[PDB]
Subunit: 93 residues, 2 copies
C-alpha cells in the first residue's frame, strides 16, 4: 500500500520563478531522504501560470504529516511562496 | 457527499470582540470564494462568553486542508486570536 498525492501550488510570491524553484529543489532533495517518502518531485508549469506541480508517493498518511514537522519543510513554508490551489489524495495497493 | 464541520473557538486575545469579528468576516468572505468551500460562516456567541462559532460545509476533507494553506487563512492564524475549544466533523451524503 502507498499514499499518492498530486498537488498544484499557486505562487503568491512575486519572486523570480527560478529563485522559487531553487527552494523547491532543495526541499525536494531533503524530503526524498525522509524515511516515509517513496517519491517527491516538484516542477513549474509554464511561467505565465505562476504555478508549481507536485508528484508525491508516501509509505502512508502519517508520513505526510511527519513531512510537515521537518525543519526543511517548515523553512520553505515560512517563506509564504505558495498556497495549494488543488490537491488529490489516493491510497493505492 | 459533503464534509460538515461545526466548531467553537475560544478567544484568547484581549482585543475588542468587534475588531476580532471584522477579521473573521474578512476571512469568511475570502474562504467562501475557495473552490472547495460550500459554506463558511462565523458569528460570536454572547460577548461575556468570548467565543466564536463556525458553521462549515466542504466538498471534502482535502478542501479543509487546502483552506489552511491559503494566505487569507494563515493571516488570521498568525494573529493568535483564538484556539479551537471543540469541533465535530461529519461526512454527509
Amino acid at each position: 500500500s502507498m499514499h499518492y498525492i498530486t498537488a498544484c501550488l499557486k505562487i503568491i510570491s512575486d519572486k523570480d520563478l527560478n529563485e522559487i524553484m531553487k527552494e523547491f529543489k532543495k526541499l525536494e532533495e531533503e524530503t526524498n531522504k525522509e524515511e516515509g517518502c517513496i517519491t517527491f518531485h516538484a516542477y513549474p508549469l509554464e511561467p505565465s501560470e505562476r504555478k508549481i506541480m507536485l508528484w508525491e508517493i508516501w509509505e502512508n498518511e502519517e508520513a505526510v504529516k511527519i513531512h510537515f514537522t521537518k525543519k526543511h519543510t517548515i523553512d520553505v513554508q515560512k517563506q509564504e511562496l505558495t498556497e495549494v490551489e488543488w490537491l488529490m489524495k489516493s491510497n493505492v495497493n
